[PDB]
């Protein structure tokens, strides 16, 4: 890499790893469209396996960006509309509180208080139906945002129903394959296990547990190379040859709702660039990010704004991920770690790197 990118990344990430006791980390910077890669530490402490550019990390909720783009692609295919009622795709959802709750509300966490987590107790398809039928909204639809797996997870499951494909097959064929993300997985195959890092939580090696709507809300694993490619694809969707995918990526960066200075996309979240770094840094802390906040509808949604900081944090029990990019500057970053360390530290490091390069 150019020495500037080298120095800027190492000066930022080295102290981060030290302060946060991160066992292993991979970083990609996309600069003028090209990726530059950096790795540190251990994918597996016990077996002394280093982090490489081929190490798989759990993306946790950065998976929501793939779900949002897959949904956008389904809209572009004419398979679903965000204006469709949820019941159009799940007619068994007959309880009256669902009247007026559309796919847009599910995709954007604005259905009226669907919870962060699907209860552990919910396994089966019928457990799931039961859960949503019994769920009681605290708020009218389209009035409050509450970040929630049970919201965007259901959006992803419903979005692929007209295709007839499983969520995983739709994701593989319509997003991973066309983008050449050939080392990105909802279920890690046995052949790729050698590359699957352990996560570390309180010093114990852990991997994400199965759960309902896991694939759709937080279940993607990927490498630093495929994630750089994901960022490049979202930075420059016009280079993408598959028309509906290009369009889906654009739709996922449309601005649907505003709360404070952030705008809710499909999976992606966006702020105007130049950002106030305290705003994105403090904003990423779960004290704010997981809070219930009133929203203003953007009527109609603003199409993808090039001058945006577009980003998403993700975590599982053992992993902490972050992706951010600025379309107008052809600039982006991916930070993958196998410890779930605090969000504000991620965003601070990212902003320090990108601000120094823009
Ligand atoms: B995501 O990483 O923000 C997330 C939120 C809640 C639960 C899970 N598994 C992921």
Does the C-beta of 116 come closer than 6 Å to ligand 1? yes
Q: Which residue has a Cα nearest atom 5 of ligand 1?
A: 61
- Technique behind the model: X-ray
CB 53, CB 356: distance < 8 Å? no
In ligand 1, the atom with minimum distance to the C-alpha of 62 is 2
| DSSP state, residue 189 | -
In sequence order, the 6+-apart residues with CB closer than 8 A to the CB of 214 are 153, 208
Does the C-beta of 149 come closer than 6 Å to ligand 1? yes
Ligand 1 center from residue 149 Cα (angstroms): 7
Does the C-beta of 150 come closer than 6 Å to ligand 1? no
Cα–Cα distance between 350 and 309 in angstroms, integer? 11
Give the distance, in angstroms, between the CA of residue 214 and the centroid of all CA atoms in the same chain.
13
Cβ atoms within 10 Å, residue 211: 18
Ligand 1 center from residue 244 Cα (angstroms): 28
Does the C-beta of 153 come closer than 6 Å to ligand 1? no
Residue 42: name the closest of 22, 58, 59, 19 by CA. 22
Tokens at 91, concatenated: 């007619």
Cα–Cα distance between 111 and 250 in angstroms, integer? 23
- Helix, strand, or coil here: 215? helix
CB 102, CB 158: distance < 8 Å? no
CB 149, CB 217: distance < 8 Å? yes
Domains of the chain: 1-358 (3.40.710.10)
323: left (phi over 0), alpha (psi -120 to 50) or beta: beta
Ligand 1 center from residue 317 Cα (angstroms): 9
CA distances from 73 to 23, 78, 246 (A): 36, 9, 8
* Binding-site positions for a beta-lactam: 61, 117, 147, 149, 315, 340
Q: Which residue has a Cα nearest atom 1 of ligand 1?
A: 61
């Amino acid at each position: 890499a150019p020495q500037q990118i080298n120095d800027i990344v190492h000066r930022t990430i080295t102290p981060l790893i030290e302060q946060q006791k991160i066992p292993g980390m991979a970083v990609a910077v996309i600069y003028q469209g090209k990726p530059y890669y950096f790795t540190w530490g251990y994918a597996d402490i016990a077996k002394k396996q280093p982090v490489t550019q081929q190490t798989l990390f759990e993306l946790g909720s950065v998976s929501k960006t793939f779900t949002g783009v897959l949904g956008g692609d389904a809209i572009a295919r004419g398979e679903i509309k965000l204006s469709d009622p949820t019941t159009k795709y799940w007619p068994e959802l007959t309880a009256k509180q669902w009247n007026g709750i559309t796919l847009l509300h599910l995709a954007t966490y604005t259905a009226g208080g669907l919870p962060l987590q699907v209860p552990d107790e919910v396994k089966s398809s019928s457990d799931l139906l039961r859960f949503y039928q019994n769920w009681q909204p605290a708020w009218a639809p389209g009035t409050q945002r509450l970040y929630a797996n049970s919201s965007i997870g259901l959006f992803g499951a419903l979005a692929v129903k007209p295709s007839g494909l499983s969520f995983e097959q739709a994701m593989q064929t319509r997003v991973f394959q066309p983008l050449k993300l050939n080392h990105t997985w909802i279920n890690v195959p046995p052949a790729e296990e050698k590359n699957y890092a352990w996560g570390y939580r309180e010093g114990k090696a852990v991997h994400v547990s199965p759960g309902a709507l896991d694939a759709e809300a937080y279940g993607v694993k990927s490498t630093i190379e495929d994630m750089a490619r994901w960022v490049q694809s979202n930075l420059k969707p016009l280079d993408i040859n598959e028309k509906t995918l290009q369009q889906g990526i654009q739709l996922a960066q449309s601005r649907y709702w505003q709360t404070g200075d952030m705008y809710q996309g499909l999976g992606w979240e966006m702020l105007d660039w130049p950002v106030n770094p305290d705003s994105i840094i403090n904003g990423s802390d779960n004290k704010i990010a997981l809070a219930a906040r009133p929203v203003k509808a953007i009527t109609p949604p603003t199409p993808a704004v090039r001058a945006s900081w577009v980003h998403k944090t993700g975590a599982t029990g053992g992993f902490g991920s972050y992706v951010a990019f600025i379309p107008e500057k052809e600039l982006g970053i991916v930070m993958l770690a196998n410890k779930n360390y605090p969000n504000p530290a991620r965003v601070d490091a990212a902003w320090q790197i990108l601000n120094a390069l823009q």
